[PDB]
Amino acid sequence: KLSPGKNAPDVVNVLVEIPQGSNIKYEYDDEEGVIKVDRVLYTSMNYPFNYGFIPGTLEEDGDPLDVLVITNYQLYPGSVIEVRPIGILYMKDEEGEDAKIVAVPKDKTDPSFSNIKDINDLPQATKNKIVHFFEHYKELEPGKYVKISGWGSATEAKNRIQLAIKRVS
Amino acid sequence: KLSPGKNAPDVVNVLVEIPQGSNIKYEYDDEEGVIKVDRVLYTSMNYPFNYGFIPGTLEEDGDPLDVLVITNYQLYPGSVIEVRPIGILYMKDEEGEDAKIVAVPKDKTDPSFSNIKDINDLPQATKNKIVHFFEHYKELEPGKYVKISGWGSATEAKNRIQLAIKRVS
Amino acid sequence: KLSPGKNAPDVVNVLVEIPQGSNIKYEYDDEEGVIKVDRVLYTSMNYPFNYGFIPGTLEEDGDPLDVLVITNYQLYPGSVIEVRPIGILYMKDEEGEDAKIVAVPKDKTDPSFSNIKDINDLPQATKNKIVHFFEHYKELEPGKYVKISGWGSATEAKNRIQLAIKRVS
Amino acid sequence: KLSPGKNAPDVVNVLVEIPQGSNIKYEYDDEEGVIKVDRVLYTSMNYPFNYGFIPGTLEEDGDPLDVLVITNYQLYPGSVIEVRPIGILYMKDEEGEDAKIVAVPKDKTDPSFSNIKDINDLPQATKNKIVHFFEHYKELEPGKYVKISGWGSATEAKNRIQLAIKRVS
Amino acid sequence: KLSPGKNAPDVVNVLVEIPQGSNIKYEYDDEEGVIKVDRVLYTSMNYPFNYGFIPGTLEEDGDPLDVLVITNYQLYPGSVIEVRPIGILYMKDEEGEDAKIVAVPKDKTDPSFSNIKDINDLPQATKNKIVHFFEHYKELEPGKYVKISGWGSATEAKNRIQLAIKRVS
Amino acid sequence: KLSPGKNAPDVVNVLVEIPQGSNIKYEYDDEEGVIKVDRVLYTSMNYPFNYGFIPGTLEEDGDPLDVLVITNYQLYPGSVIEVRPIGILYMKDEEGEDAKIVAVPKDKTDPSFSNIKDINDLPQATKNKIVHFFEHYKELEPGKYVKISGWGSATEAKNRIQLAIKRVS
Ligand SMILES: [Mg+2]
Ligand SMILES: [Mg+2]
Ligand SMILES: [Mg+2]
Ligand SMILES: [Mg+2]
Ligand SMILES: [Mg+2]
Ligand SMILES: [Mg+2]
């Protein structure tokens, strides 16, 4: 009942699962059609961004493409927001390779993020925080782990989204 | 899947979209069936009431009738509450004429609003706050504006709801 | 669209209606498919636990089986969490007999409740708080009342869930 | 270093100890000059008002006169607010007789409480909530109890404040 | 008992009075030594920044120099934070001329604001929000008003702070 | 103006600096007598406990003895609470050796922690969370680091407190 957006990949729809600041990992279950509590982070950390996925996309891992929506406020689990991809984050975990889109709200939704057009527009401190988060929030979970490969530019991210949409199309 | 209520217009159902205190304009999309983030208020203001609409009603502007639910607590976006209309607010914006119902929770739901039976039961300060809100929260948005015409009594509001229901029913 | 869980009664699904700390009694309406606001507690109290029901179960009172999910954080109304029943609470109200399951999140979801395996693992103070809550939160409501009969063990609770599931299944 | 106010008893200073909605009983210790945590309510209730005392007053019980500040927002422990007494609440506990002033913020501070000039201006539901609170929040505490005698008018309250001030000054 | 800071004007101490997001105007009273509640904004707006003053400074208006601390989190009323002035805001109100320093936390305190070195580093949207705030938050107050003259650079701000300190020193 | 408590080391006073859940490192400055914002954690973590120190104590590092107050609620910065030491945490950082007391509120203050009498009463998950926190929250800060040596029993903790008090007295 949801699509990636008429203007993909320049602007895409993101269904929020985890509000920013949260320390509870919610996960949207398309089958049952509900937001399920996967697990309460075993570490004393919290999501430094709103987390969700672009509906109508499919990655090589069989899952829709994830998005790290950067704002200074939280959104409600299950709400949809239109974002602008500004980059991509490459990483490897116990399951294998993975990539997550990094985005800010589209300009008309929140004009205070208009100057952030690419991953290099983010303060170094913010990038370090995000990287550190992914590399330590699952540590205390038996057999899990994450290692950040590197970052990608907005153009790169836009491509990943294109393929992800094509796979389902 | 929702109706205005078996006791309309004395008591009607309101599907909440924007929780009170919020500064993010959420919008319920009946098509996709989700709560979408329209935009984050460009001004440093926040909704002085829970905002939503009466399902199963239609106004001359092609949209369902809006309601300003007055309480001293927030409700969750997407939840339904039974209210008592106590008035109506008339205004004009860039799109034209508009009217919004003003209501408090029905007595059984919250007996602390039982003595507020009509618009004149609200403190002058509260009315001024609401009027000022509508006249300034969109200011910074290009080409958008709002001007309050005046207020209407509960009886007036009950009528508006009656017509709005007929149009559909 | 929801079930009690593949591992019932050892681990069951609970659809949350009232987040912990809340003083607003939300109700999930399966018909309309929405979370409605039943009422705002007339007393100055708040739910000392996340409240919800096990989907796909039926009790002698014609309603699904309730669950008191104990955690130190709130969950979003309408979200599903997997719990471990650790006990049962027996009570009688104006409508008659009633029983409510007491549970903690399943181990993988929140390993900090792993030591709590049965009702006697809960501090006496916590039990007194819960009992006192049920016996006083409806007091100010005309003709309503609740009296706690006693507590049951985890095994007892697991049985109640078994029957409740069979009735429907 | 604090006084009851230049306009006592029409408008008095109230040093807030317990923010509204709180379930932790804070107490201001004039000796040490700090806000101490007396106890965390044993019951699942919370203060339906901001609680504090009028500095520079003394009652027959050797303690300053208490005030129940009614607002729809919380104030910070240790902050001072100017209120308008609108009534008085008479009660008896394990220690003996007691009276607590009921007030709303002074008009200039919050004009939305301007219509509430006396205790009878408060909704019945609000009064019942407050009374029920005092009669049940200490129940689970060994040997403590409270019974509400009745209410007093604003004029009555203004007198109590006058005496309480004279005793000290 | 507080000073502007050993590194003034490059880094100065700011005693916070109003936490960001607040809609209650708190005021630090050096005499009584407490945080008072001046009033509750009559408009439905809230401070888009943490507000406070640099202790040990004096302006031509007889008051210490104000500071608009920009962060994406709130600080506790009465707490001190070390900031970096990045600009100054010139305005006119019913009382006359006025200037307010604009600052971000010093780098060690919060390295995510390190890239904001001057007023022109702030998004246009953020500046518009702040300006709009000052020009409308007092509107509903009888006889009050504010008009923004313009902005000043960090160097300008550093000078204002220098004078303000010498007046007292 | 504050002491460790008449019943030290069985029950001691703890002046709270950092409320639980916080991600801003507040620090009490006895000189200026204010709560200062040291820094906003560079990592996406938050204090899994209320943090503070026992007034009137001195450790070999020239600083008062720290305490990790464990509760499921936050306390206000600058407030004092009476705790029961249940253990001690040994660690080493860039500055050298360090020990921090672990405590729960005294029984009368919060009877729901009465069953936790020693460090081994805490769930393994909780201990892992605390250890992981200390070992990663300063990581992104240049030249800082922390390594946990091990835990100590309540008796051990009581001794450390005794010496720390003796040094000052
Ligand atoms: Mg993936
Ligand atoms: Mg309309
Ligand atoms: Mg039942
Ligand atoms: Mg008394
Ligand atoms: Mg000035
Ligand atoms: Mg130390």
UniProtKB/Swiss-Prot annotation, chains A, B, C, D, E, F:
Its EC number is 3.6.1.1. The keyword Metal-binding applies. Keywords: Cytoplasm, Hydrolase, Magnesium, Metal-binding. Substrate binds at K25, R39, Y51, Y137. CDD domains: pyrophosphatase. It is found in: Cytoplasm. It comes from the Archaea. Catalyzes the hydrolysis of inorganic pyrophosphate (PPi) forming two phosphate ions. Belongs to the PPase family. This is Inorganic pyrophosphatase.
